Structures are given as C-alpha cells and as structure tokens.
C-alpha cells in the first residue's frame, strides 16, 4: 500500500522523482545522453552535403529498393542516411549537393520498411523537392 | 500480536464490572496495607504480592480495597526497588543467557535469542528514561549486569 | 542602477491617475516635493486629463508659464509638481478654486470650492521634536514645519493652516468620536467616525471606523486623517459623501437615474 499520513509529503514527492526515471519517455528527454547522440542536436531540420547515393533494401515481408542519400551534416560534421521520398526524385540530385534534411516522423526512430533510416530529404540546391517533382521549378546548377 | 514472536495469542484476565469490594471481605484497607508491608519485607515483587493476597487472603483487587495500587504503596512507604520489576526480570534473564553462552559457543539459537532479550531491554529503558523512573544516563552494558541484579 | 531614476513608464504609473494604455510609453514622473509619488497628482494630469483645459503636454507648459496657477497660494511653474491631499489649487484668471480630496473609489476628484474656503487647509502632524536651544517644531505630511506649535498638539492629530501666513489657527486631536477620512489602502476615500483604536506595540495601530450608514471598516493608523471634531467636517466634501456604495446599489443608482430623462 501507499503511505498516507499527513506529514508524508517528502516521502511522496521524492519517491515520484526517482520513479520518474524508469519512464523511458522521461529519461530520453531529461538525461541529456540522447541529445548529444542525436545527429541534429534538437533541431527540426538541418543542412548537409551529399556524399553519395546509397540505396538500401526494404525489410522482410515486402521487397523493393529504397533510394537513400548519404549526407554529411554541416554544423557538426556527422553523417546521415536520408531517404529521397517520391519517384524519380533521386534524378534531381547529383553528388556534393546541399540538402535540407528533416526527420522522418517518428522522432528519431525508423519508419517501417526502411531499416535504420530516420531522416528524409526536404530541399535540394535551395529548391523544394515538391517543386521539382510536380514540375513547378527547375533544378539550379 | 506478540512483539518478538509470530503468535497472535489471546489469553489474559477479565476484570468484572462491579468495582466494589464484596460483602464477605473482613479486611480494611489499613489491614491490607499492613499485609503488603510484611509481604514486601519478605522480599517479594509487586507482581508476587498481588498473587498471595488473591489466593490466600481473598483480596480481589488491591486497587479496589485500598484505593491505591501496589507499587504506589511500596514507593510511598519506601520499600521499593530502584530498577522496576519487569526491567529486572529482563536483565536477570539476559544474564543467564549470556552466562550460559560462554560455556557453549556454538549455540546459535541462544545467540539469536539473546538479541531479542537485548532489544526488549532498550525498549523499556527508553520508556523509563522518558517517564524519569530511571536516571537519564542509565545504560545496559553487557559486562556490569551481574551486579545490577 | 547607479543613481536615481528620472523616467516613469506608463503601465507602472499609479492606477488612480487613469492614464490609458496607448498614448505613450512614458507617464509624467512627478518631481520631488511635499508628497510621495504614489500619493500625488501631478499638475499636468490636473490640467490636461481632468479639467480638459489643455490638450497636449506642451499646452500645460504654456499655461503654467504665464504664472496662472497657484498651488497652496504659491505660484508653480513646474508641470510635474506633486499636488497631494488637501492642496488648494487657485486659478485666478478664470475664478475657480479646487481642493484635492479623495472620492469614494480611491482616486482624486475635481472638487470645485469657494474662495472663502481656499484660505486654509488641514494638515496631519507626523513628528514633533524639540531642538535648537529648546524650540519645538511640527512636521506635517506636506513637510511643512511650523515651529512654536500649541503644546496640546501631538502626533496623528490635525492642525488647520492659514495659507497666506503659514501659521496654525486651531486644531483637532486624535480621539474616538472624531470624523476621519482614510487616505490609503482599500478603504481609501471613505469618511467615518472613529470607533476604536487597537494598539499593537512594535507594530501598527488599527483604527476601527464607522460609517454614517453603519458600515464599519478598519485601517492601519497611518491611513487615518482626522477631518472634523465630532461629526462636522471642517472642509467641504465631494458629491458623494465619502460613503462607498456596493456595486449592486451602484448599479441601481444608474438604472434608476436614467429614468429621469426625456
């Protein structure tokens, strides 16, 4: 049972803040060891420079080749594999290009089919991928 | 439920409702006090004097006849011990466990049974130091206890 | 900071000046004078905001610089001179005379007064000390020091000052049964008879006051200004008589006073 006195608030307030630490949603946002491990550092987006186009394989029950891009981030030098989303969207990218990268949507976890990929390309060469895919703009060289 | 035992046992005395000294008792309160002085000069505890008057002299409760209980009679006449009755019987019991223990070192039963008699002594010495029946520096030391009893 | 502040922000102004939000960043910042800056009404707010004589804070300069304004019978050419409680403002070019008295809602009021009354004001005695070859002094709440006072003037009483000469004419003492105005707190501007004064030595005296309708209230002793001996005020009173209406009957007064129209 729980303690239930009237002078027991120090037992109550301090049992909770030790028991709060077994909460993995609490710990991953308060310990600080998973924000120095995050490649962004707690930003929504980041920019980088494309090293190469590595295309990685889908997971078990369904087969395709997810076309990704190996990015090296500007602000801390870290490296990142980001997913180039729609079809024919690797054909707007060459090597050594500057790419704004987002998260995939699961807040630092992989999104189902793709293994170990937590980011997706947003803009290439300071123009948007939705502007290139839908033909609204032209790829600047 | 008993303190240092797992037994939850129910056995005690049941005092009656009628609080008065009964009809047949032909002893006044002064005669009962005079009996108590002799039975204490014989060297009996307050827990033994109340038994002898109940069995032989027909006194049900001395608190009901005299108006006062046993220990406040002896401590007002002066014939009372310094350390109280139940603290004596624990100290005297912890001597005989400790005295027997130097003969038989391997007895790990009475080594455990000594600590229960030990831990009951400090529960009572604390209470008597609080109610100031003992002086506030009395401590049970395991070596001097042969000369306390 | 390093040394004293010279500006006042507008939101940080006293609430009773009733300056709106959107006219500027700064508020008029009263000059040092007889009154605390939380307990005063600057002369720029009395001319521009209350009386609507001026329209900008340059016309108050143009009015005061013609020496048209006397505050307690001395001509004042500072527009941020702190006028406070019981101060007489004589404008002689138009012919009006005002006295700054609180009204029932914790603000000041435009209280026009007769020039037969404008020759005197009341002050409250704040500290009495001897000195300088044994000569006794007063200090009032206007910092007016009046040496050689009457020996029956003590602390927390009320004198009556003649404003052309500076001398005391007659006084009221602190007693029960005297008519008092509250000059601070949440009962500010309220007029009632002193019922009781509870002493708390090493702390503040509490002075229970009784209305003319029966509404009792209390204050600390420093928010107490003895106005009259008995029940007769030695100054005039505003349109409301220092008697605070609760908001229900304050509504009833409006919704019954609009029905006199046509």
């Amino acid at each position: 049972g729980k303690c239930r006195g009237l002078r027991t608030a120090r037992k109550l307030r301090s049992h909770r803040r030790d028991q709060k630490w077994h909460d993995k949603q609490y710990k991953k946002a308060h310990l600080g060891t998973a924000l120095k491990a995050n490649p962004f550092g707690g930003a929504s987006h980041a920019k980088g420079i494309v090293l190469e186009k590595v295309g990685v394989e889908a997971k078990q029950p369904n087969s395709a080749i997810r076309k990704c891009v190996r990015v090296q981030l500007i602000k801390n030098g870290k490296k990142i594999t980001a997913f180039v989303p729609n079809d024919g969207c690797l054909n707007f990218i060459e090597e050594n290009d500057e790419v704004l990268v987002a998260g995939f949507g699961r807040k630092g976890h992989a999104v189902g089919d793709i293994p170990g990929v937590r980011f997706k390309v947003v803009k290439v060469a300071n123009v948007s991928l939705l502007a290139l895919y839908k033909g609204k703009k032209e790829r600047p060289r | 439920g008993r303190m240092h035992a797992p037994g939850k046992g129910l056995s005690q005395s049941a005092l009656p409702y009628r609080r008065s000294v009964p009809t047949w008792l032909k002893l006044t309160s002064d005669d009962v006090k005079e009996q108590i002085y002799k039975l204490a000069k014989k060297g009996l505890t307050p827990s033994q004097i109340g038994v002898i008057l109940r069995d032989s002299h027909g006194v049900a409760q001395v608190r009901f006849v005299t108006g006062n209980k046993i220990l406040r009679i002896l401590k007002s006449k002066g014939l009372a011990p310094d350390l109280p009755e139940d603290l004596y019987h624990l100290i005297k019991k912890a001597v005989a466990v400790r005295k027997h223990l130097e003969r038989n070192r391997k007895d790990k039963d009475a080594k455990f049974r000594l600590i229960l008699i030990e831990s009951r002594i400090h529960r009572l010495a604390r209470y008597y130091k609080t109610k100031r029946v003992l002086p506030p520096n009395w401590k049970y030391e395991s070596s001097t206890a042969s000369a306390l009893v | 900071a390093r040394g004293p502040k010279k500006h006042l922000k507008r939101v940080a102004a006293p609430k009773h000046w009733m300056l709106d939000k959107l006219t500027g960043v700064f508020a008029p910042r009263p000059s040092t004078g007889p009154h605390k800056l939380r307990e005063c009404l600057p002369l720029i707010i009395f001319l521009r905001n209350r009386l609507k004589y001026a329209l900008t804070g340059d016309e108050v300069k143009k009015i005061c610089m013609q020496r048209f304004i006397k505050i307690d019978g001395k001509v004042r050419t500072d527009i941020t001179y702190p006028a406070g409680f019981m101060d007489v403002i004589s404008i002689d070019k138009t012919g009006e005379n005002f006295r700054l008295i609180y009204d029932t809602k914790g603000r000041f009021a435009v209280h026009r007064i007769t020039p037969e009354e404008a020759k005197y004001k009341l002050c409250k005695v704040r500290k009495i000390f001897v000195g300088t070859k044994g000569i006794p002094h007063l200090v009032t709440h206007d910092a007016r020091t009046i040496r050689y006072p009457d020996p029956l003037i003590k602390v927390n009483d009320t004198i009556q000052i003649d404003l052309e000469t500076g001398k005391i004419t007659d006084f009221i003492k602190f007693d029960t049964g005297n008519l008092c105005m509250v000059t601070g707190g949440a009962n500010l501007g309220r007029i009632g008879v002193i019922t009781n004064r509870e002493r708390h030595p090493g702390s503040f005296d509490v002075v229970h006051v009784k209305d003319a309708n029966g509404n009792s209230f209390a204050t600390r002793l420093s928010n107490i200004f003895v106005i009259g001996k008995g029940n007769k005020p030695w100054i005039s009173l505003p349109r409301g008589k220092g008697i605070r209406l609760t908001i229900a009957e304050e509504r009833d007064k409006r919704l019954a006073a609009k029905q006199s129209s046509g």
Partner: protein
Amino acid sequence: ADIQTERAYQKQPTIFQNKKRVLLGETGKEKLPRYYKNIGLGFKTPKEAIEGTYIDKKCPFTGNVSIRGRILSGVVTKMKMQRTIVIRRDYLHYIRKYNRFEKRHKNMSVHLSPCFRDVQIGDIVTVGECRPLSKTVRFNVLKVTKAAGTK
C-alpha cells in the same frame, strides 16, 4: 578580578566609576552603580541584570542593543561557544500537490547573555531581533522557559 579576564579593561561605558567621595563614602561602601534598561515588549529584566557583575556589550538588558523586528522562539541544542548558543526552529512546510506537510528545521546562532545562567539544552527560548552582532548572529535571548521534564 572575576570580570577582567581580557587584555583591556572591561567597563560598563555609561557609568562613571571614579567619582570623588568623602570619608563617609570610603568607609561606608564601595558601590558600583549598574546600568540596566527595560526592553519594551513586556520582557521582565532579570534580577541578575540588576545585581550582576558581568559586562556584556551585546546583552539586551545591560548593553547597547535595541530589540526591534520579529520576536521568535526555538529550543536550545548546543552551548559550546563564548556567550552564544545554537537553537533550532521546527516547522512544517506545506506541499501543495500532495496536500501534505513535511518536517523542516533551521538553526540560529543566537547571543545568550550571562544573566541567563543555568540554561540546559532542550528548553524553549524566546529570541529577539537586533542588528548584526557577528557574522551569523542577529538575535538575542530574551527569556528562558524550562523544558517540561524539569521540576
């Protein structure tokens, strides 16, 4: 000589103790008049303050301190210094979330005058606020009531 243990001369500084006397003054009595004063909040000056020979410049009955501010209380814990003791105040702090309290305590070093002699630890004492007397001491002992386990 029972006062002058220091390296300078302990002297109550308001009292002049070198008045010239006549033959009925030297043969009559060597009388040192003492300075005492009344703390104004209903604390009785002890007879030791009016009959003593101690000299203390921070005693609230015979020295140069005036008691003004908060008047508080606490129980004595450690009397191991020269003229000053350690009292602990006990209080309950309300935690709002849990609607419960918690035991709390704070210590005060506080000046004990020599008029309050025979003070044992563990009894309630009224303290009174004055100016800083040392780095940590700002209260002065005003009256000492004894713990209920006395007689």
